[PDB]
Amino acid sequence: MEPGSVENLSIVYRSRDFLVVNKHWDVRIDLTLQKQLRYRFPGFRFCHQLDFSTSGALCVALNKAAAGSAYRCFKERRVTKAYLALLRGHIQESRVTISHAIGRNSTEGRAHTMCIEGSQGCENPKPSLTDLVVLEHGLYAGDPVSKVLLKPLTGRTHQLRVHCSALGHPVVGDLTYGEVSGREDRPFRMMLHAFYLRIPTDTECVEVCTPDPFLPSLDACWSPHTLLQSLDQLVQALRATPDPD
Ligand SMILES: [Cl-]
Ligand SMILES: [Cl-]
């Protein structure tokens, strides 16, 4: 609930070689994540990125050998990631494969960087695949929303936000890819969280499953009413899934 501050940094994994933070929503990597890290641990190599408005799992390598190892997993597409989100509307399908290709917007890129293939001025579409599993239906601040688990198999910029918006179920509080009628200026944050991260490096399998922030005990505007799938069970399936070839 509280806004990002330099003194509050949540660590979810710490080894000799890696550190995984639970990045706060509306905090930039490059108030930044670097300053929070400097405050808590008076050289940090980010193994990957996480958007400003997104919270969650962000892996930092603490030495040159650890960075190189992690850089290899990402460049060879051997990393597993999953996210949680609160999306607009009740999604009636239990699972959705979202495969529309994502390109860069040439019409109004400044306001909405990315777009779906086929949309006006969409250029250089790239491979895209997001697996969406519906966890629950409920109301967010009295409006119908779906709590979902998202597993991207590709790394397009703003992929999850573009894909969910393209289905007609944008992320709640998404100021870029939400609809005008959605009044996305009203939620306290954008409801997208990097939940699960597995980086199978040569020396260490950095694997984290952060706490779930989209719970009625933490945000009283979220009122779940129908359970479709169990997140605990889906986390057991995530953990057992082989690393991508
Ligand atoms: Cl990245
Ligand atoms: Cl995204």
UniProtKB/Swiss-Prot annotation:
GO terms for molecular function: pseudouridine synthase activity; RNA binding. It comes from the Eukaryota. The modification N-acetylmethionine is found at M1. One of its GO terms (biological process) is enzyme-directed rRNA pseudouridine synthesis. Keywords: Acetylation. The active site is at D51. The keyword Acetylation applies. Belongs to the pseudouridine synthase RluA family. This is RNA pseudouridylate synthase domain-containing protein 1.
